[PDB]
Amino acid sequence: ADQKLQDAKTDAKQQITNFTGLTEPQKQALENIINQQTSRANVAKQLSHAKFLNGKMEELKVAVAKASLVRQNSNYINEDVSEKEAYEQAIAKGQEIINSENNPTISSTDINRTIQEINDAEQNLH
């Protein structure tokens, strides 16, 4: 019923508000997506997507936040400039996503690609 759909949207938006991986712009974009759904099945699909995106954003935030530890404890200080530049480029791309205010991507594949670029570059420093 209409009351069932309204309640499912409210629940989903409340869950999204609790997430810590997603940025506030990402939460707002997803809450808007939730509000536009016409069935509870579709609300659940979008909430499942938000939960997965939240996990990837958690992974991305860790990969970016650990950069100073990596610079200090890996071979970064001794490494060739190409490897150091690749790492800083990848970290900067991750920072761009996290700090974005204008319509941040809600594409988990885009996030996963950025995570993988950081992880690949970090691996070459160990």
Side-chain angles (χ1 to χ4, degrees):
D2 303 0
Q3 68 272 7
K4 304 185 187 179
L5 180 59
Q6 187 77 338
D7 289 356
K9 291 178 177 176
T10 296
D11 171 75
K13 292 182 287 178
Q14 290 173 345
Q15 295 193 47
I16 287 161
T17 302
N18 282 327
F19 294 167
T20 65
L22 300 176
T23 65
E24 305 226 1
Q26 283 174 322
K27 291 175 175 179
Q28 282 189 8
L30 284 163
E31 292 165 2
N32 184 42
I33 294 166
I34 291 293
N35 285 333
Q36 282 301 334
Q37 303 305 306
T38 64
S39 71
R40 284 177 288 161
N42 281 340
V43 171
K45 296 172 191 169
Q46 292 300 329
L47 177 62
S48 179
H49 157 232
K51 284 181 183 170
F52 178 70
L53 183 68
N54 180 62
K56 289 294 180 185
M57 284 301 297
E58 288 180 343
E59 293 184 39
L60 179 66
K61 281 176 165 179
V62 170
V64 171
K66 70 183 295 186
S68 288
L69 264 176
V70 168
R71 293 186 194 96
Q72 196 66 39
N73 301 126
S74 72
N75 261 243
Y76 176 90
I77 294 171
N78 300 312
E79 258 295 350
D80 299 327
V81 63
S82 61
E83 280 90 329
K84 298 175 75 179
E85 296 290 315
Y87 185 65
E88 299 304 342
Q89 290 170 5
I91 288 295
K93 291 180 183 291
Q95 289 169 343
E96 186 76 12
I97 294 170
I98 294 161
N99 298 314
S100 174
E101 265 185 322
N102 173 309
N103 177 79
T105 177
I106 50 156
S107 166
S108 56
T109 50
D110 292 329
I111 301 301
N112 196 62
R113 185 172 298 281
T114 305
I115 295 161
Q116 195 62 65
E117 290 183 13
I118 294 167
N119 290 344
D120 287 352
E122 184 188 328
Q123 182 181 42
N124 287 331
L125 302 173
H126 295 292

